[PDB]
């Protein structure tokens, strides 16, 4: 997939003044565009960015005219984002003293897209305009503009100082015109395409999520020996690790090729050096001694397999397996290979039967040849959009461990007295992060942890920024929004003072 980005900011006069209690739309949307360029910089996505800082005191645009396409400075055309562009935006921008139309800039960016998005392969186009709606605009080309946006496949969004839920009549009629235009583009849902500037901060503050496409792995779901079904494996969860990762470079020269991580193999006697990649044969420890195994004998005596071999070993009760024992690296999602409906309905029969009879399947698994086989739970899942089945590694016997762990109900030496018990009751009721809402028993899960970005990547991108935007400078601390993000929502902490206080007088806390 591909996308084209053309941001449009105004550098007029009105945004140079605002209420002293709130930052001006100039600097507000300025921080917004800065950190948006940050987003599409860190993400390695092939999105190409262009900038139009219209409302200029001059006019530097390919469509310059006396009154047609006037007061526009195209910052740079539709190419890849890069740091120096961000720095120049942070610096080169200047407060203005003029006022200019935005439909002008909209058509200018339209022409840029029509002039470049066909010269290079593209799939979807986006136009974004930031302004304060203090312009003098005529509704002449709006029909034609929206027509081209439909034909050129460009989505228009507007971002405005006011909130939908104190502006000039100029701004008010501009807002009505904006509503008309957006509805004239998509429909009634055009209301959602109206955006303020504070909510832009709220919805944008986090760094870009690391989206990760999976692989269409189709497999033959085998049950018995005569009921093969084409099955498509997709994914639900994987411990995500960074994709760009640390290149080792020499100081004061900063070239990668100037370093060799060559490995040399020696002998313990007189430091004799062994020839690197043919005199060593891999051994193994069998008690005291070492057995000269090798690589060729490895490939000859290694265990073999037929291949995909996703074959059902059998069916079992839900409680027959447990949460604890789930031994997977990753959790698959088991869906039908598309375009074969009969397979899908057969799988649906499977899933629903397992669901109502709370039965669970156990299937031999293997991603492919030369890979270790795998046995684990095949759990079925139901969603109103679609039924689901998921596979997880469950342990082999050597992988399971056993421990005594002397029990606790022998607490004649610990003695949880009733005062402590009802104290802990007061706690676990009072710090209850989740509490029922809307009478639908959707508890107060304002800590889903499923929508929350991984702070590791947040800190990594923040570091790369802070030491990219600057030359050598010391690192900053954790941005407070990250900490507020990681910490529980405040009200839970507020409710917690009294119960923890009653804890501190009821237990020993030796050093």
């Amino acid at each position: 997939n591909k996308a084209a980005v053309v941001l449009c900011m105004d550098v007029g006069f009105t945004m140079s003044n605002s209420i002293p209690g709130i930052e001006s739309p100039f600097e507000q949307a300025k921080k917004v565009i800065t950190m948006f360029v940050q987003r599409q910089v860190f993400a390695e996505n092939k999105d190409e960015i262009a900038l139009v800082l219209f409302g200029t005191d001059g006019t530097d645009n390919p469509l310059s005219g006396g009154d047609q396409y006037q007061n526009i400075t195209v910052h740079r055309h539709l190419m890849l984002p890069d740091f120096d562009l961000l720095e120049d935006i942070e610096s080169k921008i200047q407060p203005g003293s003029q006022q200019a139309d935005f439909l002008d800039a909209l058509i200018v960016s339209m022409d840029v897209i029509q002039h470049e998005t066909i010269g290079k392969k593209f799939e979807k186009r986006h136009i974004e305009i930031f302004t304060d709606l203090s312009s003098r605009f005529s509704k002449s080309q709006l029909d034609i503009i929206i027509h081209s946006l439909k034909k050129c496949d460009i989505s228009l969004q507007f971002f405005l100082p006011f909130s939908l839920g104190g502006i000039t009549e100029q701004q008010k009629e501009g807002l009505e015109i904006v509503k008309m235009v957006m509805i004239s583009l998509e429909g009634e849902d055009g209301l959602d395409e109206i955006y303020s500037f504070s909510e832009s901060l709220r919805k944008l503050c986090v760094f870009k999520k690391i989206e990760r496409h999976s692989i269409h792995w189709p497999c033959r779901l085998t049950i018995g020996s005569n009921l093969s079904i084409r099955i498509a494996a997709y994914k639900s969860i994987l411990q995500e690790r960074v994709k760009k990762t640390w290149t080792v470079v020499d100081a004061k020269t900063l070239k990668k090729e100037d370093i060799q991580k060559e490995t040399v193999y020696c002998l313990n006697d007189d430091d004799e050096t062994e020839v690197l990649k043919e005199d060593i044969i891999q051994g193994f420890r069998y008690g005291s001694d070492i057995v000269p195994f090798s690589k060729v004998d490895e490939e000859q005596m290694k265990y073999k397999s037929e291949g995909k071999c996703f074959s059902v070993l059998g069916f079992c009760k839900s409680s027959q397996v447990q949460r604890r024992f789930f031994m997977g690296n990753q959790v698959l999602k088991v869906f039908a290979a598309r375009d074969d409906e009969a397979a899908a309905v057969a799988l649906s029969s499977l899933i629903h039967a397992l669901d109502d009879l709370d039965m669970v399947a156990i299937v031999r698994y293997a991603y492919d040849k030369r890979a270790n086989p795998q046995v684990g739970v095949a759990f079925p899942h139901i969603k109103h959009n679609y039924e689901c089945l998921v596979y997880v590694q469950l342990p082999f016997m050597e992988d399971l461990r056993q421990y005594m762990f002397s029990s606790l109900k022998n607490s004649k030496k610990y003695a949880p007295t009733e005062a402590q018990l009802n104290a802990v009751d007061a706690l676990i009721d009072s710090m209850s992060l989740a509490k029922k809402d809307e009478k639908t028993d959707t508890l107060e899960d304002l800590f889903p942890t499923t929508k929350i970005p991984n702070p590791r990547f947040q800190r990594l991108f923040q570091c790369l920024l802070h030491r990219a935007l600057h030359p050598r400078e010391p690192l900053p601390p954790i941005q407070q929004h990250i900490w507020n993000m990681l910490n529980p929502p405040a009200e839970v902490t507020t409710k917690s003072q009294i119960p923890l206080s009653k804890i501190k007088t009821l237990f020993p806390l030796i050093e």
Binding site: H126, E128, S155, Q157, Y195, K203, E211
Partner: peptide, 7 residues
Amino acid sequence: KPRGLFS
């Protein structure tokens, strides 16, 4: 779900 500008 949020898309485009938000995604």
